[PDB]
Design a protein around this motif. Structure first.
Motif, mmCIF file in Angstrom:
data_model
loop_
_atom_site.group_PDB
_atom_site.id
_atom_site.type_symbol
_atom_site.label_atom_id
_atom_site.label_comp_id
_atom_site.label_asym_id
_atom_site.label_seq_id
_atom_site.Cartn_x
_atom_site.Cartn_y
_atom_site.Cartn_z
ATOM 1 N N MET B 114 4.113 14.196 -6.665
ATOM 2 C CA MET B 114 2.941 13.366 -6.451
ATOM 3 C C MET B 114 2.573 12.597 -7.698
ATOM 4 O O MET B 114 2.256 11.408 -7.637
ATOM 5 C CB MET B 114 1.760 14.223 -6.013
ATOM 6 C CG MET B 114 0.674 13.433 -5.310
ATOM 7 S SD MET B 114 1.120 13.066 -3.611
ATOM 8 C CE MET B 114 0.244 11.557 -3.370
ATOM 9 N N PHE B 118 3.377 8.726 -6.939
ATOM 10 C CA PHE B 118 2.188 7.955 -6.570
ATOM 11 C C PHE B 118 1.130 7.831 -7.659
ATOM 12 O O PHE B 118 0.428 6.826 -7.739
ATOM 13 C CB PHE B 118 1.529 8.541 -5.313
ATOM 14 C CG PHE B 118 0.257 7.837 -4.910
ATOM 15 C CD1 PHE B 118 0.295 6.545 -4.380
ATOM 16 C CD2 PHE B 118 -0.984 8.450 -5.087
ATOM 17 C CE1 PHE B 118 -0.881 5.871 -4.033
ATOM 18 C CE2 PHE B 118 -2.170 7.780 -4.742
ATOM 19 C CZ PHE B 118 -2.111 6.486 -4.214
ATOM 20 N N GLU B 119 0.999 8.840 -8.503
ATOM 21 C CA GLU B 119 -0.019 8.769 -9.534
ATOM 22 C C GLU B 119 0.295 7.763 -10.614
ATOM 23 O O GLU B 119 -0.494 6.852 -10.863
ATOM 24 C CB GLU B 119 -0.238 10.130 -10.163
ATOM 25 C CG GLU B 119 -1.265 10.103 -11.260
ATOM 26 C CD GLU B 119 -2.115 11.342 -11.270
ATOM 27 O OE1 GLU B 119 -3.062 11.395 -12.083
ATOM 28 O OE2 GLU B 119 -1.831 12.256 -10.463
ATOM 29 N N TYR B 122 0.142 4.159 -9.326
ATOM 30 C CA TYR B 122 -1.241 3.764 -9.095
ATOM 31 C C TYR B 122 -1.949 3.506 -10.429
ATOM 32 O O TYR B 122 -2.548 2.453 -10.632
ATOM 33 C CB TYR B 122 -1.947 4.876 -8.301
ATOM 34 C CG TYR B 122 -3.460 4.833 -8.329
ATOM 35 C CD1 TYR B 122 -4.150 3.649 -8.065
ATOM 36 C CD2 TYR B 122 -4.201 5.972 -8.642
ATOM 37 C CE1 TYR B 122 -5.530 3.594 -8.114
ATOM 38 C CE2 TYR B 122 -5.600 5.924 -8.695
ATOM 39 C CZ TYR B 122 -6.251 4.729 -8.430
ATOM 40 O OH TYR B 122 -7.619 4.655 -8.503
ATOM 41 N N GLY B 148 9.220 6.546 3.818
ATOM 42 C CA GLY B 148 7.780 6.485 3.715
ATOM 43 C C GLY B 148 7.182 6.092 5.057
ATOM 44 O O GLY B 148 5.962 6.049 5.202
ATOM 45 N N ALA B 149 8.036 5.797 6.038
ATOM 46 C CA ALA B 149 7.565 5.399 7.362
ATOM 47 C C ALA B 149 8.240 6.163 8.479
ATOM 48 O O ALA B 149 7.735 6.202 9.600
ATOM 49 C CB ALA B 149 7.790 3.921 7.568
ATOM 50 N N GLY B 159 8.312 11.509 1.275
ATOM 51 C CA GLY B 159 7.836 10.463 2.162
ATOM 52 C C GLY B 159 6.321 10.317 2.234
ATOM 53 O O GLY B 159 5.828 9.288 2.699
ATOM 54 N N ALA B 160 5.571 11.325 1.795
ATOM 55 C CA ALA B 160 4.116 11.211 1.817
ATOM 56 C C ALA B 160 3.673 10.375 0.618
ATOM 57 O O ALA B 160 2.773 9.544 0.725
ATOM 58 C CB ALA B 160 3.471 12.584 1.763
ATOM 59 N N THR B 161 4.302 10.604 -0.529
ATOM 60 C CA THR B 161 3.972 9.848 -1.736
ATOM 61 C C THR B 161 4.230 8.352 -1.535
ATOM 62 O O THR B 161 3.545 7.513 -2.104
ATOM 63 C CB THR B 161 4.828 10.300 -2.925
ATOM 64 O OG1 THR B 161 6.186 9.895 -2.713
ATOM 65 C CG2 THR B 161 4.777 11.798 -3.074
ATOM 66 N N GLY B 163 4.282 6.907 1.563
ATOM 67 C CA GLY B 163 3.363 6.441 2.582
ATOM 68 C C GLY B 163 2.046 6.065 1.921
ATOM 69 O O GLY B 163 1.411 5.085 2.300
ATOM 70 N N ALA B 164 1.637 6.851 0.927
ATOM 71 C CA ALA B 164 0.395 6.609 0.193
ATOM 72 C C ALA B 164 0.505 5.299 -0.573
ATOM 73 O O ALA B 164 -0.397 4.459 -0.532
ATOM 74 C CB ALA B 164 0.125 7.757 -0.771
ATOM 75 N N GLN B 167 0.107 1.994 1.490
ATOM 76 C CA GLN B 167 -1.270 1.680 1.846
ATOM 77 C C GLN B 167 -2.007 1.108 0.644
ATOM 78 O O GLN B 167 -2.882 0.252 0.788
ATOM 79 C CB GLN B 167 -1.981 2.937 2.356
ATOM 80 C CG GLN B 167 -3.409 2.707 2.833
ATOM 81 C CD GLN B 167 -3.564 1.411 3.601
ATOM 82 O OE1 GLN B 167 -2.636 0.957 4.270
ATOM 83 N NE2 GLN B 167 -4.739 0.806 3.508
ATOM 84 N N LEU B 168 -1.654 1.579 -0.544
ATOM 85 C CA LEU B 168 -2.281 1.087 -1.765
ATOM 86 C C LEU B 168 -1.811 -0.354 -2.039
ATOM 87 O O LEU B 168 -2.510 -1.155 -2.667
ATOM 88 C CB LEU B 168 -1.907 2.006 -2.935
ATOM 89 C CG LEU B 168 -2.475 1.688 -4.314
ATOM 90 C CD1 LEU B 168 -3.969 2.015 -4.352
ATOM 91 C CD2 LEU B 168 -1.718 2.497 -5.360
ATOM 92 N N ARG B 170 -1.195 -2.691 0.302
ATOM 93 C CA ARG B 170 -1.990 -3.557 1.173
ATOM 94 C C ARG B 170 -3.428 -3.799 0.708
ATOM 95 O O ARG B 170 -3.963 -4.893 0.883
ATOM 96 C CB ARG B 170 -2.028 -2.981 2.589
ATOM 97 C CG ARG B 170 -0.664 -2.685 3.191
ATOM 98 C CD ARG B 170 -0.793 -2.042 4.577
ATOM 99 N NE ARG B 170 0.469 -1.452 5.029
ATOM 100 C CZ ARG B 170 0.661 -0.155 5.272
ATOM 101 N NH1 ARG B 170 -0.324 0.723 5.111
ATOM 102 N NH2 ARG B 170 1.853 0.269 5.667
#
Ligand SMILES: NC(=O)C1=CN([C@@H]2O[C@H](COP(=O)(O)OP(=O)(O)OC[C@H]3O[C@@H](n4cnc5c(N)ncnc54)[C@H](OP(=O)(O)O)[C@@H]3O)[C@@H](O)[C@H]2O)C=CC1
Ligand SMILES: NC(=O)C1=CN([C@@H]2O[C@H](COP(=O)(O)OP(=O)(O)OC[C@H]3O[C@@H](n4cnc5c(N)ncnc54)[C@H](OP(=O)(O)O)[C@@H]3O)[C@@H](O)[C@H]2O)C=CC1
Lengths: 259, 259
Positions: B114, B118-119, B122, B148-149, B159-161, B163-164, B167-168, B170
């Motif tokens: 994570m 994603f961190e 971001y 991710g989809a 795949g969750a990282t 997917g997150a 969204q960030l 968009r």
């Protein structure tokens, strides 16, 4: 349990002291399900049980702080025993919002929201697994959001946590298929809960929210019960073939572009 | 920069010592841009600089463990000074994978993926905001993934990282639009990188990859220079109307169902 009811099924719904969680607990309990819920406040939980039990619902609840991993493993032990090691439904509803721009989040804001909205939903998920399996007919539902798939003001990180939730869902559907568990996600659009009214308190959050409602087909907010209905159906044995799906109860919001 | 080149633009590309990243450094530099990359290994980075500088590419690199808040601010401080407070391009390419079922993931494991996936992406986009803004013509590109989809074996949490991250992408495209920054994502399919050589060493994983490759129209792994070509285009002034999109470079993998 019958084809269109949960008579006799055991369920665990997180964050059931108010809003959608409260509607999900009532809907499921009224269809035959025995429920267990949790919130961070006991007095509130107790007043809930008072109302719920006067309606003949079989329900039990207890204080839990889902941001605390240790407290999460305590809750599963408690529920596991309560239902004698058999849980048919896990509804991951608990969630918190922080209305700030992406660049205005503190490490505390981010750490708090990622642990309650995602990690917690993921953790209980995994904890409940053996109990969902032993049920011989398990079901897991994640309460996502339209903001997990589209841009909405102040919900970048909030949307990030749900977008991650949506994917865990698709995967878990295939990973637990052989375990007799079906995993689906339900994405609310705009539902008249307490989280919303606190939002409209702000003359700008209120302005943002009336933009979303005006973007629905139905042009109005949903009711906790209209949302709880989708969750309920997914748990009926009549939905045996539905799994790994993210369905939205948004009055049309998702499908809109220029209306 | 001309309409179809990056002449004069500065860029930071996380994880450019191997695979897709290494390829992106080459395509941006080859198209006239000044790049700054990073990896967790000095020696590796030093052979790259030699390879790139030998070809006439303007390029610098420093060591940095993206899974560290402080090291991350350290790297942005250096980038910003190296480029005089102007940054046109930020490609968040770094990532890792831990091939375990969701229920088998340890907390240490979860924290690792994570944080890097994603961190740091971001967090880096944020620290970069002022330099992208100062640059007057910003472009942030996040390397996502097909996983991710869609459900893929052992990529539930990986795949969750992603997917997150999607969204960030968009929301930023909406939050930063006024700052003249464009935000997009490029979801690779199966690309022949060092991450893949490692994977196909284990017989079962070698079998899984072959399933994937067997499922794209072109029935073959993409090449690093194939994924990089799409990253570079989105940075071109020619793609000035493309913002908030997740584009897949997967040989048709995301369009298939029964082929
Ligand atoms: N209605 C809407 O506008 C929409 C809501 N959603 C999603 O729906 C879900 C529910 O939202 P909604 O009903 O409006 O929310 P509410 O704020 O009305 O209620 C949330 C419930 O979850 C509980 N909860 C929150 N954090 C914790 C925690 N850390 N530990 C234990 N319990 C907790 C709350 O109890 P307590 O406060 O006492 O801890 C409360 O009972 C969320 O996941 C939200 O993200 C998504 C789209 C739309
Ligand atoms: N290869 C494929 O088929 C696919 C790849 N992707 C995505 O492509 C991107 C690159 O992958 P790929 O090139 O294949 O992988 P590689 O392992 O070949 O390269 C990853 C690069 O990122 C760097 N990196 C990893 N962790 C860190 C860290 N903590 N700090 C600094 N640098 C780091 C690595 O350097 P080092 O290890 O030396 O520190 C390396 O330079 C990732 O975002 C991945 O998720 C998505 C789908 C498919």
């Amino acid at each position: 349990a019958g084809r269109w009811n949960l008579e006799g099924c055991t369920a665990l719904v997180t964050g059931g002291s108010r809003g959608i969680g409260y509607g999900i607990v009532e809907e499921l309990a009224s269809l035959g399900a025995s429920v267990y819920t949790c919130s961070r406040n006991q007095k509130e939980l107790n007043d809930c049980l008072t109302q719920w039990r006067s309606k003949g619902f079989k329900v039990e609840a207890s204080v839990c702080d889902l941001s605390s991993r240790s407290e999460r493993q305590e809750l599963m032990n408690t529920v596991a025993n309560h239902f004698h090691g058999k849980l048919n439904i896990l509804v991951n509803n608990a969630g918190i919002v922080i209305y700030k721009e992406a660049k205005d989040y503190t490490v505390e804001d981010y750490s708090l929201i990622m642990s309650i909205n995602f990690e917690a939903a993921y953790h209980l998920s995994v904890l409940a697994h053996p109990f969902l399996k032993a049920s011989e007919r398990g079901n897991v539902v994640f309460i996502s959001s339209v903001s997990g798939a589209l841009a909405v003001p102040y919900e970048a990180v909030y949307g990030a946590t749900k977008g991650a939730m949506d994917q865990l869902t698709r995967c878990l559907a295939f990973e637990w298929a052989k375990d007799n568990i079906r995993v689906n996600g339900v994405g609310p659009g705009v539902i008249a809960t307490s989280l919303v009214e606190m939002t409209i308190q702000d003359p700008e959050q209120k302005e943002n929210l009336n933009k979303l409602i005006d973007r629905c087909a139905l042009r109005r907010m949903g009711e906790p019960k209209e949302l709880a209905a989708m969750v309920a159906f997914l748990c009926f044995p009549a939905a045996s073939y539905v799994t790994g799906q993210i369905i939205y109860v948004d009055g049309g919001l998702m499908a809109n572009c220029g209306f």
